[PDB]
């Protein structure tokens, strides 16, 4: 059981409670460790641990930079000669029982890295250069098989049922981009195109964009671009619904706006776009909208029912929503915000490091907990809709910018005080306001052609 000295090879330091802790028996579950110990167990000489490699490569950016990880696995790979007894059999055993397994597991880590987290190398061309140069130094028949599989993955990554229904149109005509609006597009097609858009945004989020609250930090535009696009779309669309409502000062027109949004909601439900469903529910519960007694008074009972049923999905910490999401059949778009809430709760209720005898250990169980949440997200990221894109409508909703250059605080105050203008507080009477729409308010309904 020979080994190089821990002075010339850091990974040979003995396990202790001050550098690695396991969960409270064949393969242990790591709870915490120094980065050096985590990497040793990532590439352990005694066994492979795919589940640990999986969790590590999803979460490691919360405790180690990508260029740093590559440096550490190179350090891991380049094993020095073992420390000598005063006096080949023990030498040969070291190369067969230590060097070869460790170096193979390092290459497996590199393969998993490019196979499932190639975006690290798309964001950092030099990281990919270092990796290609490193695996280029590898010698031996057994390991060139792994070099070959890594190289083939990299090359492929550099390169990269039935008819959908007819697109529906209402007042706005195809190609008439300047006429597109809440009441002028067909409510079926608004819901379809937003569902296609939100399906795409949901499917693009990588689990690592969700780790370590990295989307609320300094490099967020590089580390969480797809997550940020999702969140900002949900903000812009929700605020656009509120804006369409309160900027419609005439009561009859505003009832038509709210009714139409409930029809879009109904189609979201039929499409299992729970993301869209809860965006509508959020708009209807918002400060500027929820207080509009005179508007909700005129909503027909059947639509009140649809809104009430969507709202109840959110009660009791989304109990009915979680039940409905289990029971539906694909395709769907899950409600994305609930995962962010659960992740932030996990991030806040667990420490970044654990202490043992004054030494700091990366709390890996905390990363595993977040990774389990991101795994449930992934289970829904391959469910395309049999719906045709309308490129102009898609662009209309991609470009929604209700706030303009203002910030959400001033903008929300703007919406809320507008609400007070159109429906004054309860002693005051209700003024009449001019119409703003010259086209008919009557909905075409949500039955397809």
């Amino acid at each position: 059981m020979r080994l190089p000295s821990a002075d010339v090879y850091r990974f040979a330091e003995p396990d202790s409670e001050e550098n690695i802790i396991f969960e409270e028996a064949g393969i242990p579950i790591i709870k915490a460790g120094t980065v050096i110990k985590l990497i040793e167990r990532l590439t352990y000489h005694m066994y492979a641990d795919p589940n640990f490699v999986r969790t590590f490569l999803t979460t490691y950016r919360s405790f180690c930079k990508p260029q740093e990880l590559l440096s550490l696995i190179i350090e891991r790979f380049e094993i020095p000669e073992p420390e000598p007894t005063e006096a080949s059999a023990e030498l040969k055993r070291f190369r067969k029982e230590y060097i070869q397994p460790v170096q193979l597991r390092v290459l497996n880590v590199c393969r998993h890295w490019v196979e499932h987290h190639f975006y690290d190398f798309e964001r950092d061309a030099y990281l990919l250069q270092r990796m290609e140069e490193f695996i280029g130094t590898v010698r031996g028949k057994a390991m060139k098989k792994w070099v070959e599989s890594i190289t083939k993955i990299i090359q492929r990554k550099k390169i990269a049922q039935s008819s959908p229904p007819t697109v529906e149109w209402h007042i706005s005509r195809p190609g008439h981009i300047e006429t597109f609006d809440l009441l002028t597009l067909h409510p079926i097609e608004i819901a379809r195109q937003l569902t296609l858009l939100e399906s795409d945004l949901y499917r693009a989020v990588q689990p690592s964009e969700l780790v370590g609250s990295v989307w609320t930090k300094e490099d967020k535009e590089i580390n969480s671009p797809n997550l940020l696009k999702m969140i900002r779309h949900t903000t812009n669309l929700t605020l656009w619904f509120e804006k369409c409502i309160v900027e419609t000062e005439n009561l009859e027109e505003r009832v038509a706006v709210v009714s139409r949004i409930i029809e879009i909601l109904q189609v979201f439900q039929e499409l299992n776009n729970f993301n869209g469903v809860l965006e509508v529910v959020s708009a209807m519960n918002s400060s500027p909208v929820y207080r509009l007694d005179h508007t909700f008074e005129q909503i027909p009972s059947r639509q009140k029912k649809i809104l009430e049923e969507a709202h109840e999905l959110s009660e009791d910490h989304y109990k009915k929503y979680l039940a409905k999401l289990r029971s539906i059949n694909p395709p769907c778009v899950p409600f994305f915000g609930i995962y962010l809430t659960n992740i932030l709760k996990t991030e806040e209720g667990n420490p970044e490091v654990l202490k043992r005898h004054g030494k700091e250990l990366i709390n890996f169980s905390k990363r595993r907990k977040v990774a389990e949440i991101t795994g449930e997200i992934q289970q829904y990221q391959n469910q395309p809709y049999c719906l045709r894109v309308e490129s102009d409508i898609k662009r209309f909703f991609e470009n929604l910018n209700p706030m303009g250059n203002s910030m959400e605080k001033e903008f929300t105050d703007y919406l809320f005080n507008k609400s007070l203008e159109i429906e004054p507080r309860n002693p005051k009477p209700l003024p009449r306001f001019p119409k703003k729409y010259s086209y008919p308010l009557k909905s075409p309904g949500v039955r397809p052609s």
Partner: nanobody
Framework: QVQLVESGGGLVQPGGSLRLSCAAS????????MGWYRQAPGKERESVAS???????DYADSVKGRFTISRDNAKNTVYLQMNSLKPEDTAVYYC???????????WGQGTQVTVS
């Protein structure tokens, strides 16, 4: 619905101050609107102050600058801090919530405030 329990209130000199409190039987963080109304003798009941989850507030004109509505999530309580009280503020004050779809309004018991 929501059971609402008011406290505070009573008699105070003109120019004095008083804080009403209203405790909810459920978590206020999911209650869209909490507010206070009042009915002075001879008049109809009027809204005094309201407060939404995101902190948006509105007030009767006659109390702007003097009254402040706020929430305390840890105690599931909404407050009405009333400063610079005037004899025209004498009334029964009522805690209220509006939340959910259907939009359910709940009411506290009513609390006498006398400024004389």
């Amino acid at each position: 619905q929501v059971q609402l329990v008011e406290s505070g209130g009573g008699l105070v000199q003109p120019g004095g101050s008083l804080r009403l409190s209203c405790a909810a039987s459920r978590s206020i963080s999911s209650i869209n609107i909490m507010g206070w109304y009042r009915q002075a003798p001879g008049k109809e009941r009027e809204s005094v102050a309201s407060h939404t989850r995101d902190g948006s507030t509105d007030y009767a004109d006659s109390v702007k600058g003097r009254f402040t509505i706020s929430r305390d999530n840890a105690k599931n309580t909404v407050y009405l801090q009333m400063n610079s009280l005037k004899p025209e503020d004498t009334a029964v004050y009522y805690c209220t919530t509006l939340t959910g779809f259907p939009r359910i309004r709940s009411w506290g018991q009513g609390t006498q405030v006398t400024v004389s």
